[PDB]
Amino acid sequence: SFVQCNHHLLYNGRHWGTIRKKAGWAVRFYEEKPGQPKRLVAICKNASPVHCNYLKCTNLAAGFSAGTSTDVLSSGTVGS
Q1: CA 18 to CA 1: how far, in whole Å?
Q2: How far apart are CA 80 and CA 65, in angstroms?
Q3: How many angstroms separate the CA atoms of 55 and 66, rounded?
Q4: Which burial class, exposed, middle or buried, applies to 34 when counting CB atoms under 10 A from its CB (0-12, 13-18, 19+)?
Q5: Measured at the alpha carbon of residue 9, what is the angle toward residues 14 and 80, in degrees to the nearest 5?
Q6: CB hemisphere CA count around 80 (13 angstroms)
Q7: Which pairing describes strands 65-70 and 4-11: parallel, antiparallel, or unpaired?
Q8: Which domain holds residue 17?
Q9: What are the residues whose beta carbons fall under 8 Å from the beta carbon of 11, sequence distance 6 or more?
Q10: Which of 30, 53, 67, 76 could form a disulfide with 10 if both were Cys (CB 3.0 to 4.6 A apart)?
């Protein structure tokens, strides 16, 4: 059925972070630099609102973009 998945945000060269969110539902990605407020780097949601496939993100912050999902679907990953 509808799948919940940790939406991975990909940072230049390596896994930045992830937020677990259901497919279809939009999730928030932002950069928080020490001493500065967090800035939205991507608003991303999974293609299908049912199953998990790929992440469609809008308002990308250059190198800040999302990649894939693990843990719940993959089992045994460096997610969150």
Answers
A1: 22
A2: 17
A3: 7
A4: exposed
A5: 85
A6: 13
A7: antiparallel
A8: 1-80
A9: 17, 63, 64
A10: 67
Solved how?
A: NMR
Look at the chain and report how many structural domains it folds into. 1
- Whole-angstrom distance, CA of residue 53 vs CA of residue 55: 7
Q: What is the CATH number of the domain that holds 60?
A: 2.60.320.40
User: What would the DSSP string read from start to end of 36-80?
Assistant: S--EEEEEEEES-SSS---EEEES-BTTBEEEEEETTTT-S-S--
Chain centroid to CA 68: 7
How is residue 35 written in tokens? 């001493």
